[model samples]
Target: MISYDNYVTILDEETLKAWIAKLEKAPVFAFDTETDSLDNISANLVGLSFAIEPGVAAYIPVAHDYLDAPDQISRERALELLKPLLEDEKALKVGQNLKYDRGILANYGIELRGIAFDTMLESYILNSVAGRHDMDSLAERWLKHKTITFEEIAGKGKNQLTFNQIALEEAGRYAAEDADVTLQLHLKMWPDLQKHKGPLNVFENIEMPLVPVLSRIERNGVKIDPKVLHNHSEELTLRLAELEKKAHEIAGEEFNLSSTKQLQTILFEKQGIKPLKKTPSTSEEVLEELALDYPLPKVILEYRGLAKLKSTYTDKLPLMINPKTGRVHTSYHQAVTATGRLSSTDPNLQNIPVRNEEGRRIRQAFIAPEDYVIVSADYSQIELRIMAHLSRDKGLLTAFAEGKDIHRATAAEVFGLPLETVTSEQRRSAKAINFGLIYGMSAFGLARQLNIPRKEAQKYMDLYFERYPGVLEYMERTRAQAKEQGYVETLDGRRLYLPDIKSSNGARRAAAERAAINAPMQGTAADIIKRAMIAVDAWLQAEQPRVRMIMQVHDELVFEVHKDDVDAVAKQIHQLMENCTRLDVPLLVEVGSGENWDQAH
Candidate 1:
């Protein structure tokens, strides 16, 4: 009989049955899966481990098929035994990044429920930007213990071994250690999470419930029309060819438009455009400023834009479409952002441009299948409304409450003009001022954005702050709070920590001050959208409507709804999003439906 110190290998039915009983009665158990493939979409369960205490853990190898492999329980029988324990609503399950585990288990016809805690989320909610939220990082930080990495046992690169191929002794120890370390991490981090009300509230309400919601959204990916993308790719190719020819003509010789160094030489050394502000760079911003006066830079800018559109979207999106699902799935990352906002990868849907016509045409490919239409519901001025609520400025609140054009209202107040007499140019300046302030932009930034003198920008800022003193007060108060507490909170208490709030470096400290002012509004908007997703998901589960939430981009949620159910689903989605959170100003959602995403928007 082979024996291990704190890790046990369950090779027989009797040992497995005994382990299940012990796991069932524990208040919470940390569980993890050892899989054959890293991709959750196609992974097969090689083994599973469970740890109910800090030191002891057990690994049950079910499908290790290596030559002369040890006898193990059958996959079907083990999952059958483990199903009740995993699915029990009362028995709590804890894990590190349970989202991936949830998706893996879901592939085995088991809906792994009872997710009471995720250690990764606990670390994130405690302090998002402190360090990495991965298991190894958390283990090192919280327990002061270095973990046995996967590569340590399985080797690296082309010679690497999968879990099933590794010897049972090595694989068992590694897999069991994962569950044991995860439980220990939970024990170590949970106390810190409980030390504050705000972080705890965020953990319990916003971050935890969102795990499964993101999982479902990843699985229910948006449908794409590859034919549309191919056509767009062709058009973009033709346009790119023309722009390249024009750029070469303007430069008087053919040069690589993509090469920044080459462009810098052509622009400064050859064309003699008088390098702007002492930087020998060809960055987009510098190019944009130069394009105002030079033709070569203008052609270069157009070439770069179309090339980006061609490469990132037109040429790449169709190849990303999953053959089995016939849709493009994006993975939503929960722990990546500091302000509780979610980000996506694998054909990042978040960055599809909306400002340009060519970019907007990419969205035309995100179409609904037959008998369905794309329904997009976006929050109207979400961050601005969040700012109004946070500031409680009467001028801002009254404008949103009265349904007045906020930019026009600001123009009237700052320029000392009647609302009806505010010209488009003044309103445009006000728009810049409003958005710039939300991003914690300085007077110089406003001046650059609006192409005005710094003194005029300062004057406008002074007039605006003078009229809406509450906003000024709120910003000062937020900065003070961050300095004292090293963090700021959203409306529902999601914390964003500023580590450099008290730095001696003026640039770093100033940046932290700006973040202190902006994070609350941005974080609150993030929290509101999460609440909306949770609510919408719950309704979808219960009502079983012909609607699938296909995408979440910034303040917008896109769905594919059956044509017959569009009206009802659209109305409900709008109401659900609007009612998810209450503020000084009402939350509003703009809903539209059409054959494709762009048309719906």
Candidate 2:
């Protein structure tokens, strides 16, 4: 029998086939890969490992091209033999960050199937605040086994050997220990996962199913029009120069717009503009406050906005286009963000600016392919809607239930005016309060945000709580729960522990209280969107692939659809996303279509 710390080193075609047979018979297989680089998009797959039973595994070193390396089955041959085992829907293939393995496998034209478990995600669900979830971390935390480091096999940069360059003996043990450690780690963590219903449901229902969905989204990346970005970039450069010239004119001398010291000199030293507070910082926040008090700071804010859009999006995105796919393939991380929100990297799609015209123009470059339309499906005022559900505030619930304009309704209720009589300015103020409470913003913070007197902001909050007594009740009850239990839970029962809820430090304790108030709504919002992604992906596969679900930013799912099928697709998406789960206050979806992402949104 295969036993702990022992592996069948697969070097020949016959040996590879024998291990494949062993792998298929196992109920759960711990799978892993050793590659040339961390970028799965273009990494060279040197080998893959599999642990069929606890601590018993095999390492198939397929591309050990180093001097006098022992003969081995080709990377192609090994995978060809292993595909049936890897893809068997009846069984399971487990790994840490299986998405990267799935991606690398895709490079070899194999769609990894039966991805039943991931140790990394398991640890994350178990306790996201506990520690890191890498294989080394997991092995240390759970198994207390110090495994071989990759650097020991492949030395650090410059002197480093790629996976293929490492000799077989060193590579094989290091690689095989990974799968061995992974399988053992799974055994150690499974009991905790089984005992906890919230983490179990979150793992099985939410995270597992979305794995393939995210894999597809990563593979089917969004197309960009470089010409559009370049044009926008040039236009932004000209606008930035004009803003700089205006700033110079206001300052009575030219200064580098990029320099903070120069801005401090011009704002406080030269012009002597009064600041908001002694510690106003004169950073972006102070500059923003100063913008209201002075024209120079206003232009500086506008200039900074354009500069960010230009440098971050316009100039950066086109360069991110993959040479092979010709689309920007952002890596979506599931285990990131304690609140369960999905964040992306290598040109983060989530952080792309969208609040201004220049920012909107950058989004315009994210175009659909020929004969396709970009379909944007967003949960309109979702977090606010979540707040309503969590709070069960009568006024908030009634406004949503009637499909009335929530912010306007809020404005009328707070000011004691009829909803129809609410002015745009009133609606804007109400909008601030509606969203502000969800962030645990105090009236003082609200005063800063709205550029209003602190008493007026306090009045708005007082009236807001009066109109929605349930919301205030929910906040007070939630804070009590956090203080008593040391944690808060989402609607789906995902627990986020609050360390500072009982702190003696006033500021820190207050901040923890705010976070405790906000975590459930935000975390639940994350939970809902993830469930939506799973359902949407399932429907896309079972119903139609004509529309490719590509991007999932907060409260929104972006897709590229067949042009003739836009209406059909849009209507179905609205239904799927809306019905993914039921919320107490009701869920709403806004669907739009256009040639580019900005237009679609």
Q: Which candidate comes out best when scored by TM-score?
A: 1
**lDDT (tens digit, per residue) of candidate 1 on 11-125:** 9999999989999889899999999876677678999999989887999999998999988999999999899888887989889988888888888888878888999999899
- In candidate 2, how many Å is residue 116 off? 1.5
Residue 368 in candidate 1 has what lDDT? 92
Poorly placed runs, candidate 1 (over 4 Å): 1-4, 258-261, 264-272, 276-284, 583-585
Highest lDDT against the true fold, candidate: 1
Question: Using alpha carbons, what is the TM-score of model 2?
Answer: 0.94
TM-score of each: 0.95, 0.94
The lDDT of each candidate is 0.87, 0.83
Candidate 2 segments whose C-alpha is farther than 4 A from its true place: 1-6, 258-260, 268-284, 289-293, 583-585
TM-score of predicted model 1? 0.95
